[PDB]
mmCIF file of N, CA, C and O in Angstrom:
data_model
loop_
_atom_site.group_PDB
_atom_site.id
_atom_site.type_symbol
_atom_site.label_atom_id
_atom_site.label_comp_id
_atom_site.label_asym_id
_atom_site.label_seq_id
_atom_site.Cartn_x
_atom_site.Cartn_y
_atom_site.Cartn_z
ATOM 1 N N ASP A 197 54.712 59.194 22.680
ATOM 2 C CA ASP A 197 53.564 58.352 22.351
ATOM 3 C C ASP A 197 52.269 59.155 22.311
ATOM 4 O O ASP A 197 51.439 58.944 21.420
ATOM 5 N N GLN A 198 52.076 60.074 23.260
ATOM 6 C CA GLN A 198 50.812 60.803 23.299
ATOM 7 C C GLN A 198 50.700 61.765 22.123
ATOM 8 O O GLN A 198 49.602 61.989 21.600
ATOM 9 N N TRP A 199 51.821 62.340 21.684
ATOM 10 C CA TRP A 199 51.783 63.177 20.491
ATOM 11 C C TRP A 199 51.413 62.358 19.266
ATOM 12 O O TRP A 199 50.633 62.809 18.419
ATOM 13 N N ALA A 200 51.972 61.154 19.148
ATOM 14 C CA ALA A 200 51.590 60.293 18.032
ATOM 15 C C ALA A 200 50.103 59.961 18.083
ATOM 16 O O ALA A 200 49.411 59.984 17.054
ATOM 17 N N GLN A 201 49.594 59.662 19.281
ATOM 18 C CA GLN A 201 48.174 59.365 19.431
ATOM 19 C C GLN A 201 47.313 60.551 19.022
ATOM 20 O O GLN A 201 46.296 60.383 18.343
ATOM 21 N N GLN A 202 47.700 61.760 19.428
ATOM 22 C CA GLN A 202 46.919 62.940 19.075
ATOM 23 C C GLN A 202 46.954 63.202 17.572
ATOM 24 O O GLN A 202 45.940 63.607 16.985
ATOM 25 N N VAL A 203 48.108 62.994 16.933
ATOM 26 C CA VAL A 203 48.180 63.154 15.483
ATOM 27 C C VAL A 203 47.232 62.180 14.801
ATOM 28 O O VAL A 203 46.486 62.549 13.885
ATOM 29 N N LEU A 204 47.241 60.922 15.247
ATOM 30 C CA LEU A 204 46.323 59.942 14.676
ATOM 31 C C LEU A 204 44.872 60.356 14.906
ATOM 32 O O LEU A 204 44.028 60.229 14.010
ATOM 33 N N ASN A 205 44.577 60.878 16.098
ATOM 34 C CA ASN A 205 43.220 61.299 16.425
ATOM 35 C C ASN A 205 42.733 62.385 15.476
ATOM 36 O O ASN A 205 41.642 62.287 14.905
ATOM 37 N N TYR A 206 43.533 63.428 15.288
ATOM 38 C CA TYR A 206 43.048 64.532 14.468
ATOM 39 C C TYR A 206 43.102 64.213 12.979
ATOM 40 O O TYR A 206 42.302 64.756 12.208
ATOM 41 N N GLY A 207 43.987 63.310 12.552
ATOM 42 C CA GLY A 207 43.898 62.813 11.188
ATOM 43 C C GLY A 207 42.599 62.069 10.940
ATOM 44 O O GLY A 207 41.922 62.280 9.925
ATOM 45 N N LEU A 208 42.226 61.191 11.873
ATOM 46 C CA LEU A 208 40.933 60.526 11.769
ATOM 47 C C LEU A 208 39.803 61.543 11.752
ATOM 48 O O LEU A 208 38.822 61.381 11.018
ATOM 49 N N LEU A 209 39.924 62.595 12.563
ATOM 50 C CA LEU A 209 38.881 63.612 12.618
ATOM 51 C C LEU A 209 38.703 64.289 11.265
ATOM 52 O O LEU A 209 37.575 64.437 10.773
ATOM 53 N N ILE A 210 39.812 64.710 10.646
ATOM 54 C CA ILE A 210 39.691 65.390 9.360
ATOM 55 C C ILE A 210 39.126 64.442 8.315
ATOM 56 O O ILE A 210 38.266 64.832 7.522
ATOM 57 N N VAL A 211 39.557 63.178 8.317
ATOM 58 C CA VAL A 211 39.036 62.234 7.331
ATOM 59 C C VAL A 211 37.526 62.077 7.491
ATOM 60 O O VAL A 211 36.757 62.210 6.524
ATOM 61 N N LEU A 212 37.081 61.817 8.723
ATOM 62 C CA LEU A 212 35.671 61.539 8.962
ATOM 63 C C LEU A 212 34.805 62.736 8.603
ATOM 64 O O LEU A 212 33.826 62.600 7.858
ATOM 65 N N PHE A 213 35.130 63.918 9.137
ATOM 66 C CA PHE A 213 34.306 65.076 8.803
ATOM 67 C C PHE A 213 34.392 65.438 7.331
ATOM 68 O O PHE A 213 33.370 65.768 6.732
ATOM 69 N N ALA A 214 35.573 65.361 6.716
ATOM 70 C CA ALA A 214 35.652 65.611 5.286
ATOM 71 C C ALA A 214 34.611 64.788 4.541
ATOM 72 O O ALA A 214 33.681 65.337 3.937
ATOM 73 N N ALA A 215 34.705 63.460 4.644
ATOM 74 C CA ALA A 215 33.809 62.609 3.864
ATOM 75 C C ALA A 215 32.348 62.836 4.239
ATOM 76 O O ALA A 215 31.504 63.130 3.375
ATOM 77 N N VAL A 216 32.031 62.733 5.532
ATOM 78 C CA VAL A 216 30.636 62.735 5.958
ATOM 79 C C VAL A 216 29.993 64.089 5.696
ATOM 80 O O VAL A 216 28.870 64.173 5.184
ATOM 81 N N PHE A 217 30.687 65.172 6.050
ATOM 82 C CA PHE A 217 30.117 66.498 5.891
ATOM 83 C C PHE A 217 30.008 66.878 4.423
ATOM 84 O O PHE A 217 29.063 67.568 4.031
ATOM 85 N N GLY A 218 30.950 66.428 3.585
ATOM 86 C CA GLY A 218 30.784 66.633 2.157
ATOM 87 C C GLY A 218 29.526 65.971 1.633
ATOM 88 O O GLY A 218 28.743 66.583 0.898
ATOM 89 N N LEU A 219 29.299 64.716 2.032
ATOM 90 C CA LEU A 219 28.080 64.026 1.620
ATOM 91 C C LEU A 219 26.836 64.768 2.097
ATOM 92 O O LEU A 219 25.890 64.988 1.327
ATOM 93 N N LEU A 220 26.821 65.161 3.372
ATOM 94 C CA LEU A 220 25.639 65.798 3.939
ATOM 95 C C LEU A 220 25.356 67.137 3.273
ATOM 96 O O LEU A 220 24.197 67.462 2.992
ATOM 97 N N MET A 221 26.398 67.927 3.007
ATOM 98 C CA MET A 221 26.197 69.210 2.348
ATOM 99 C C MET A 221 25.734 69.036 0.910
ATOM 100 O O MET A 221 24.902 69.811 0.432
ATOM 101 N N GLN A 222 26.245 68.027 0.202
ATOM 102 C CA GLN A 222 25.765 67.787 -1.154
ATOM 103 C C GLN A 222 24.282 67.422 -1.150
ATOM 104 O O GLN A 222 23.493 67.947 -1.951
ATOM 105 N N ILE A 223 23.880 66.540 -0.228
ATOM 106 C CA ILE A 223 22.472 66.156 -0.137
ATOM 107 C C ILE A 223 21.605 67.361 0.197
ATOM 108 O O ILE A 223 20.555 67.583 -0.423
ATOM 109 N N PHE A 224 22.020 68.151 1.191
ATOM 110 C CA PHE A 224 21.230 69.309 1.596
ATOM 111 C C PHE A 224 21.127 70.330 0.474
ATOM 112 O O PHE A 224 20.061 70.912 0.252
ATOM 113 N N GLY A 225 22.225 70.561 -0.244
ATOM 114 C CA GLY A 225 22.181 71.495 -1.350
ATOM 115 C C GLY A 225 21.213 71.061 -2.427
ATOM 116 O O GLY A 225 20.394 71.854 -2.888
ATOM 117 N N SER A 226 21.272 69.788 -2.825
ATOM 118 C CA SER A 226 20.334 69.316 -3.841
ATOM 119 C C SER A 226 18.894 69.460 -3.366
ATOM 120 O O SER A 226 18.055 70.058 -4.060
ATOM 121 N N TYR A 227 18.604 68.963 -2.159
ATOM 122 C CA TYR A 227 17.254 69.066 -1.612
ATOM 123 C C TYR A 227 16.744 70.491 -1.625
ATOM 124 O O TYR A 227 15.632 70.759 -2.093
ATOM 125 N N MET A 228 17.527 71.422 -1.098
ATOM 126 C CA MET A 228 16.950 72.720 -0.807
ATOM 127 C C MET A 228 17.012 73.633 -2.024
ATOM 128 O O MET A 228 16.198 74.552 -2.158
ATOM 129 N N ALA A 229 17.962 73.397 -2.931
ATOM 130 C CA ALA A 229 17.885 74.047 -4.230
ATOM 131 C C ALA A 229 16.632 73.611 -4.969
ATOM 132 O O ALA A 229 16.027 74.404 -5.699
ATOM 133 N N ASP A 230 16.224 72.351 -4.795
ATOM 134 C CA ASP A 230 14.962 71.917 -5.389
ATOM 135 C C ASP A 230 13.781 72.688 -4.805
ATOM 136 O O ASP A 230 12.764 72.881 -5.480
ATOM 137 N N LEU A 231 13.901 73.135 -3.555
ATOM 138 C CA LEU A 231 12.815 73.838 -2.878
ATOM 139 C C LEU A 231 12.421 75.115 -3.606
ATOM 140 O O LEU A 231 13.278 75.897 -4.027
ATOM 141 N N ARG A 232 11.113 75.324 -3.739
ATOM 142 C CA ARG A 232 10.559 76.530 -4.334
ATOM 143 C C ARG A 232 9.286 76.909 -3.591
ATOM 144 O O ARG A 232 8.528 76.049 -3.137
ATOM 145 N N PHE A 233 9.055 78.215 -3.474
ATOM 146 C CA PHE A 233 7.907 78.767 -2.755
ATOM 147 C C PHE A 233 6.850 79.194 -3.768
ATOM 148 O O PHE A 233 6.848 80.333 -4.238
ATOM 149 N N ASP A 234 5.945 78.282 -4.094
ATOM 150 C CA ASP A 234 4.829 78.602 -4.974
ATOM 151 C C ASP A 234 3.635 77.746 -4.566
ATOM 152 O O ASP A 234 3.607 77.180 -3.469
ATOM 153 N N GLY A 235 2.654 77.640 -5.450
ATOM 154 C CA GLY A 235 1.425 76.940 -5.162
ATOM 155 C C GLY A 235 1.443 75.452 -5.424
ATOM 156 O O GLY A 235 0.373 74.839 -5.485
ATOM 157 N N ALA A 236 2.618 74.846 -5.584
ATOM 158 C CA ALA A 236 2.720 73.420 -5.873
ATOM 159 C C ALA A 236 3.156 72.600 -4.667
ATOM 160 O O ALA A 236 2.614 71.517 -4.425
ATOM 161 N N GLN A 237 4.127 73.087 -3.904
ATOM 162 C CA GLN A 237 4.691 72.347 -2.787
ATOM 163 C C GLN A 237 4.187 72.926 -1.473
ATOM 164 O O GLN A 237 4.290 74.135 -1.244
ATOM 165 N N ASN A 238 3.645 72.064 -0.621
ATOM 166 C CA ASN A 238 3.196 72.492 0.696
ATOM 167 C C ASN A 238 4.363 73.073 1.476
ATOM 168 O O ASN A 238 5.337 72.370 1.768
ATOM 169 N N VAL A 239 4.262 74.360 1.820
ATOM 170 C CA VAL A 239 5.389 75.059 2.432
ATOM 171 C C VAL A 239 5.725 74.459 3.791
ATOM 172 O O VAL A 239 6.901 74.356 4.164
ATOM 173 N N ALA A 240 4.708 74.051 4.550
ATOM 174 C CA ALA A 240 4.969 73.416 5.837
ATOM 175 C C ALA A 240 5.743 72.116 5.655
ATOM 176 O O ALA A 240 6.685 71.838 6.405
ATOM 177 N N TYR A 241 5.366 71.321 4.656
ATOM 178 C CA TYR A 241 6.071 70.075 4.382
ATOM 179 C C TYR A 241 7.536 70.336 4.057
ATOM 180 O O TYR A 241 8.433 69.685 4.602
ATOM 181 N N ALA A 242 7.793 71.296 3.172
ATOM 182 C CA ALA A 242 9.161 71.579 2.760
ATOM 183 C C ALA A 242 10.000 72.104 3.920
ATOM 184 O O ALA A 242 11.159 71.705 4.085
ATOM 185 N N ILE A 243 9.439 73.005 4.725
ATOM 186 C CA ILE A 243 10.195 73.552 5.846
ATOM 187 C C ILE A 243 10.477 72.472 6.879
ATOM 188 O O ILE A 243 11.582 72.399 7.435
ATOM 189 N N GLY A 244 9.490 71.617 7.157
ATOM 190 C CA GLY A 244 9.739 70.495 8.044
ATOM 191 C C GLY A 244 10.832 69.587 7.522
ATOM 192 O O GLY A 244 11.673 69.108 8.285
ATOM 193 N N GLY A 245 10.847 69.352 6.210
ATOM 194 C CA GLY A 245 11.903 68.535 5.637
ATOM 195 C C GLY A 245 13.273 69.160 5.796
ATOM 196 O O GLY A 245 14.249 68.481 6.129
ATOM 197 N N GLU B 173 -35.638 133.931 -17.428
ATOM 198 C CA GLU B 173 -34.863 132.914 -18.127
ATOM 199 C C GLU B 173 -33.501 132.738 -17.485
ATOM 200 O O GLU B 173 -32.995 131.617 -17.387
ATOM 201 N N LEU B 174 -32.892 133.831 -17.033
ATOM 202 C CA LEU B 174 -31.593 133.700 -16.385
ATOM 203 C C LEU B 174 -31.713 132.990 -15.045
ATOM 204 O O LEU B 174 -30.831 132.207 -14.675
ATOM 205 N N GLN B 175 -32.791 133.247 -14.299
ATOM 206 C CA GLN B 175 -33.028 132.495 -13.071
ATOM 207 C C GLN B 175 -33.097 131.006 -13.363
ATOM 208 O O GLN B 175 -32.478 130.190 -12.668
ATOM 209 N N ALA B 176 -33.851 130.633 -14.399
ATOM 210 C CA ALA B 176 -33.982 129.219 -14.738
ATOM 211 C C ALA B 176 -32.647 128.629 -15.177
ATOM 212 O O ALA B 176 -32.305 127.498 -14.808
ATOM 213 N N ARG B 177 -31.876 129.380 -15.963
ATOM 214 C CA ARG B 177 -30.579 128.889 -16.415
ATOM 215 C C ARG B 177 -29.634 128.668 -15.244
ATOM 216 O O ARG B 177 -28.932 127.653 -15.182
ATOM 217 N N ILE B 178 -29.605 129.605 -14.294
ATOM 218 C CA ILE B 178 -28.732 129.449 -13.135
ATOM 219 C C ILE B 178 -29.189 128.274 -12.280
ATOM 220 O O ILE B 178 -28.367 127.541 -11.717
ATOM 221 N N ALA B 179 -30.505 128.078 -12.158
ATOM 222 C CA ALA B 179 -30.998 126.923 -11.415
ATOM 223 C C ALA B 179 -30.542 125.625 -12.069
ATOM 224 O O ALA B 179 -30.109 124.686 -11.387
ATOM 225 N N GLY B 180 -30.607 125.562 -13.397
ATOM 226 C CA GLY B 180 -30.083 124.395 -14.083
ATOM 227 C C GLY B 180 -28.589 124.227 -13.882
ATOM 228 O O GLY B 180 -28.081 123.104 -13.819
ATOM 229 N N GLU B 181 -27.863 125.341 -13.793
ATOM 230 C CA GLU B 181 -26.432 125.256 -13.530
ATOM 231 C C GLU B 181 -26.162 124.660 -12.157
ATOM 232 O O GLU B 181 -25.248 123.841 -11.991
ATOM 233 N N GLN B 182 -26.941 125.067 -11.155
ATOM 234 C CA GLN B 182 -26.830 124.436 -9.845
ATOM 235 C C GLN B 182 -27.150 122.953 -9.937
ATOM 236 O O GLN B 182 -26.542 122.133 -9.242
ATOM 237 N N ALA B 183 -28.110 122.590 -10.788
ATOM 238 C CA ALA B 183 -28.413 121.176 -10.977
ATOM 239 C C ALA B 183 -27.208 120.426 -11.531
ATOM 240 O O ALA B 183 -26.892 119.317 -11.080
ATOM 241 N N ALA B 184 -26.519 121.017 -12.507
ATOM 242 C CA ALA B 184 -25.334 120.374 -13.070
ATOM 243 C C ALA B 184 -24.224 120.253 -12.029
ATOM 244 O O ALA B 184 -23.517 119.239 -11.977
ATOM 245 N N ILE B 185 -24.055 121.280 -11.195
ATOM 246 C CA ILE B 185 -23.052 121.214 -10.133
ATOM 247 C C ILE B 185 -23.394 120.106 -9.142
ATOM 248 O O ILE B 185 -22.515 119.371 -8.675
ATOM 249 N N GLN B 186 -24.677 119.971 -8.804
ATOM 250 C CA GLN B 186 -25.108 118.886 -7.930
ATOM 251 C C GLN B 186 -24.817 117.528 -8.554
ATOM 252 O O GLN B 186 -24.406 116.585 -7.864
ATOM 253 N N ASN B 187 -25.040 117.407 -9.862
ATOM 254 C CA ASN B 187 -24.718 116.163 -10.547
ATOM 255 C C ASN B 187 -23.226 115.870 -10.470
ATOM 256 O O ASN B 187 -22.816 114.714 -10.304
ATOM 257 N N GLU B 188 -22.397 116.905 -10.591
ATOM 258 C CA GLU B 188 -20.958 116.715 -10.426
ATOM 259 C C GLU B 188 -20.627 116.241 -9.015
ATOM 260 O O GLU B 188 -19.739 115.401 -8.824
ATOM 261 N N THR B 189 -21.327 116.773 -8.010
ATOM 262 C CA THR B 189 -21.125 116.300 -6.641
ATOM 263 C C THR B 189 -21.446 114.818 -6.525
ATOM 264 O O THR B 189 -20.708 114.054 -5.882
ATOM 265 N N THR B 190 -22.551 114.398 -7.137
ATOM 266 C CA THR B 190 -22.912 112.985 -7.123
ATOM 267 C C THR B 190 -21.823 112.142 -7.775
ATOM 268 O O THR B 190 -21.439 111.087 -7.248
ATOM 269 N N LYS B 191 -21.308 112.601 -8.915
ATOM 270 C CA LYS B 191 -20.254 111.865 -9.603
ATOM 271 C C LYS B 191 -19.023 111.718 -8.724
ATOM 272 O O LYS B 191 -18.409 110.646 -8.676
ATOM 273 N N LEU B 192 -18.639 112.787 -8.026
ATOM 274 C CA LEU B 192 -17.480 112.701 -7.143
ATOM 275 C C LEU B 192 -17.712 111.689 -6.028
ATOM 276 O O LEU B 192 -16.809 110.910 -5.686
ATOM 277 N N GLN B 193 -18.915 111.681 -5.451
ATOM 278 C CA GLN B 193 -19.213 110.692 -4.416
ATOM 279 C C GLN B 193 -19.071 109.273 -4.948
ATOM 280 O O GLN B 193 -18.484 108.402 -4.287
ATOM 281 N N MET B 194 -19.600 109.018 -6.143
ATOM 282 C CA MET B 194 -19.527 107.661 -6.672
ATOM 283 C C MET B 194 -18.091 107.276 -6.989
ATOM 284 O O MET B 194 -17.699 106.119 -6.802
ATOM 285 N N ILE B 195 -17.291 108.227 -7.473
ATOM 286 C CA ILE B 195 -15.889 107.930 -7.743
ATOM 287 C C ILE B 195 -15.174 107.548 -6.457
ATOM 288 O O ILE B 195 -14.368 106.610 -6.433
ATOM 289 N N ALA B 196 -15.454 108.263 -5.366
ATOM 290 C CA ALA B 196 -14.824 107.915 -4.092
ATOM 291 C C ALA B 196 -15.231 106.517 -3.638
ATOM 292 O O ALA B 196 -14.386 105.726 -3.187
ATOM 293 N N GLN B 197 -16.522 106.193 -3.755
ATOM 294 C CA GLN B 197 -16.967 104.858 -3.360
ATOM 295 C C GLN B 197 -16.289 103.783 -4.200
ATOM 296 O O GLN B 197 -15.878 102.740 -3.677
ATOM 297 N N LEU B 198 -16.157 104.023 -5.504
ATOM 298 C CA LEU B 198 -15.496 103.060 -6.376
ATOM 299 C C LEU B 198 -14.028 102.893 -6.010
ATOM 300 O O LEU B 198 -13.491 101.780 -6.067
ATOM 301 N N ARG B 199 -13.353 103.988 -5.662
ATOM 302 C CA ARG B 199 -11.953 103.892 -5.267
ATOM 303 C C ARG B 199 -11.797 103.020 -4.030
ATOM 304 O O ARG B 199 -10.922 102.144 -3.975
ATOM 305 N N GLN B 200 -12.650 103.235 -3.027
ATOM 306 C CA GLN B 200 -12.571 102.398 -1.831
ATOM 307 C C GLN B 200 -12.895 100.942 -2.151
ATOM 308 O O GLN B 200 -12.254 100.020 -1.624
ATOM 309 N N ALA B 201 -13.867 100.713 -3.039
ATOM 310 C CA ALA B 201 -14.212 99.347 -3.426
ATOM 311 C C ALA B 201 -13.040 98.642 -4.096
ATOM 312 O O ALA B 201 -12.774 97.465 -3.822
ATOM 313 N N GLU B 202 -12.332 99.331 -4.985
ATOM 314 C CA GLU B 202 -11.227 98.669 -5.668
ATOM 315 C C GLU B 202 -10.013 98.508 -4.765
ATOM 316 O O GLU B 202 -9.233 97.565 -4.949
ATOM 317 N N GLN B 203 -9.844 99.378 -3.768
ATOM 318 C CA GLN B 203 -8.857 99.087 -2.731
ATOM 319 C C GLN B 203 -9.206 97.796 -2.000
ATOM 320 O O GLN B 203 -8.326 96.965 -1.719
ATOM 321 N N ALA B 204 -10.491 97.605 -1.692
ATOM 322 C CA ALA B 204 -10.916 96.350 -1.080
ATOM 323 C C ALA B 204 -10.626 95.163 -1.993
ATOM 324 O O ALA B 204 -10.211 94.098 -1.523
ATOM 325 N N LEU B 205 -10.849 95.326 -3.299
ATOM 326 C CA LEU B 205 -10.524 94.255 -4.239
ATOM 327 C C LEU B 205 -9.038 93.921 -4.212
ATOM 328 O O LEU B 205 -8.658 92.748 -4.287
ATOM 329 N N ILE B 206 -8.183 94.941 -4.140
ATOM 330 C CA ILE B 206 -6.745 94.689 -4.099
ATOM 331 C C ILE B 206 -6.376 93.907 -2.846
ATOM 332 O O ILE B 206 -5.583 92.957 -2.898
ATOM 333 N N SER B 207 -6.939 94.296 -1.701
ATOM 334 C CA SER B 207 -6.668 93.544 -0.479
ATOM 335 C C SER B 207 -7.155 92.106 -0.605
ATOM 336 O O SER B 207 -6.490 91.169 -0.142
ATOM 337 N N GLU B 208 -8.313 91.911 -1.235
ATOM 338 C CA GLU B 208 -8.834 90.564 -1.426
ATOM 339 C C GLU B 208 -7.903 89.733 -2.298
ATOM 340 O O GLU B 208 -7.699 88.543 -2.043
ATOM 341 N N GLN B 209 -7.334 90.340 -3.340
ATOM 342 C CA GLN B 209 -6.411 89.607 -4.203
ATOM 343 C C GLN B 209 -5.122 89.261 -3.464
ATOM 344 O O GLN B 209 -4.553 88.180 -3.666
ATOM 345 N N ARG B 210 -4.643 90.168 -2.610
ATOM 346 C CA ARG B 210 -3.492 89.837 -1.773
ATOM 347 C C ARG B 210 -3.794 88.634 -0.891
ATOM 348 O O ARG B 210 -2.964 87.724 -0.753
ATOM 349 N N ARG B 211 -4.981 88.616 -0.281
ATOM 350 C CA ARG B 211 -5.350 87.475 0.550
ATOM 351 C C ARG B 211 -5.475 86.208 -0.283
ATOM 352 O O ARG B 211 -5.126 85.117 0.177
ATOM 353 N N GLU B 212 -5.964 86.330 -1.516
ATOM 354 C CA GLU B 212 -6.037 85.167 -2.395
ATOM 355 C C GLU B 212 -4.655 84.590 -2.654
ATOM 356 O O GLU B 212 -4.459 83.371 -2.593
ATOM 357 N N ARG B 213 -3.680 85.453 -2.938
ATOM 358 C CA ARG B 213 -2.331 84.962 -3.200
ATOM 359 C C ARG B 213 -1.735 84.307 -1.961
ATOM 360 O O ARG B 213 -1.159 83.213 -2.040
ATOM 361 N N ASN B 214 -1.864 84.955 -0.798
ATOM 362 C CA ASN B 214 -1.257 84.370 0.394
ATOM 363 C C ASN B 214 -1.987 83.112 0.840
ATOM 364 O O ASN B 214 -1.400 82.287 1.547
ATOM 365 N N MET B 215 -3.249 82.950 0.450
ATOM 366 C CA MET B 215 -3.955 81.710 0.726
ATOM 367 C C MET B 215 -3.508 80.608 -0.224
ATOM 368 O O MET B 215 -3.408 79.445 0.177
ATOM 369 N N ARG B 216 -3.241 80.958 -1.483
ATOM 370 C CA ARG B 216 -2.766 79.965 -2.441
ATOM 371 C C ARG B 216 -1.377 79.462 -2.077
ATOM 372 O O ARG B 216 -1.091 78.268 -2.217
ATOM 373 N N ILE B 217 -0.496 80.356 -1.626
ATOM 374 C CA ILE B 217 0.850 79.928 -1.253
ATOM 375 C C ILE B 217 0.813 79.021 -0.028
ATOM 376 O O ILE B 217 1.466 77.972 0.003
ATOM 377 N N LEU B 218 0.051 79.403 0.990
ATOM 378 C CA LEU B 218 0.097 78.756 2.293
ATOM 379 C C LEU B 218 -0.848 77.569 2.416
ATOM 380 O O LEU B 218 -0.857 76.915 3.461
ATOM 381 N N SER B 219 -1.632 77.274 1.382
ATOM 382 C CA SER B 219 -2.747 76.346 1.525
ATOM 383 C C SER B 219 -2.269 74.947 1.890
ATOM 384 O O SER B 219 -1.171 74.523 1.525
ATOM 385 N N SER B 220 -3.117 74.231 2.627
ATOM 386 C CA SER B 220 -2.855 72.854 3.027
ATOM 387 C C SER B 220 -3.345 71.839 2.007
ATOM 388 O O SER B 220 -3.126 70.639 2.195
ATOM 389 N N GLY B 221 -4.009 72.286 0.944
ATOM 390 C CA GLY B 221 -4.445 71.373 -0.096
ATOM 391 C C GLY B 221 -3.340 70.904 -1.014
ATOM 392 O O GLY B 221 -3.579 70.015 -1.838
ATOM 393 N N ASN B 222 -2.149 71.477 -0.894
ATOM 394 C CA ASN B 222 -1.009 71.085 -1.706
ATOM 395 C C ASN B 222 -0.338 69.854 -1.115
ATOM 396 O O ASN B 222 -0.420 69.594 0.087
ATOM 397 N N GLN B 223 0.326 69.089 -1.980
ATOM 398 C CA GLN B 223 1.021 67.886 -1.534
ATOM 399 C C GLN B 223 2.414 67.711 -2.123
ATOM 400 O O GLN B 223 3.167 66.871 -1.621
ATOM 401 N N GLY B 224 2.806 68.478 -3.135
ATOM 402 C CA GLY B 224 4.116 68.313 -3.740
ATOM 403 C C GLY B 224 5.244 68.565 -2.756
ATOM 404 O O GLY B 224 5.078 69.151 -1.688
ATOM 405 N N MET B 225 6.423 68.095 -3.135
ATOM 406 C CA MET B 225 7.609 68.128 -2.296
ATOM 407 C C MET B 225 8.813 68.570 -3.105
ATOM 408 O O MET B 225 8.870 68.348 -4.319
ATOM 409 N N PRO B 226 9.794 69.200 -2.464
ATOM 410 C CA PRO B 226 11.117 69.296 -3.088
ATOM 411 C C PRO B 226 11.820 67.951 -3.010
ATOM 412 O O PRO B 226 11.987 67.381 -1.931
ATOM 413 N N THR B 227 12.226 67.443 -4.166
ATOM 414 C CA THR B 227 12.713 66.079 -4.282
ATOM 415 C C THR B 227 14.212 66.005 -4.027
ATOM 416 O O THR B 227 14.920 67.012 -4.026
ATOM 417 N N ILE B 228 14.685 64.784 -3.801
ATOM 418 C CA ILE B 228 16.101 64.502 -3.608
ATOM 419 C C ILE B 228 16.558 63.649 -4.782
ATOM 420 O O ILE B 228 16.136 62.493 -4.920
ATOM 421 N N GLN B 229 17.422 64.211 -5.622
ATOM 422 C CA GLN B 229 17.939 63.505 -6.788
ATOM 423 C C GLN B 229 19.133 64.249 -7.373
ATOM 424 O O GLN B 229 19.319 65.438 -7.118
#
């Protein structure tokens, strides 16, 4: 029983991190690829973001 | 006449000395200009008058 429980636990773990971390990395990539260091965007604002 | 000519030659050499001094002063002045332009660029990049953002889309 405990082996079955652990298998279910780590399957849930892979599912949750797969979906959530994929979403978070896609959002972060879009945001920070948009980032540019020039005279248009306040650098403090962008770094804080 | 040769005394006078040599005296004029010393005058020309003195004028060359003056020219060298002014060239040195100009070189230092334009180094100062370059530093000022560097400060202008780093002030433009870092300025707080900007408001744009990297967008999410």
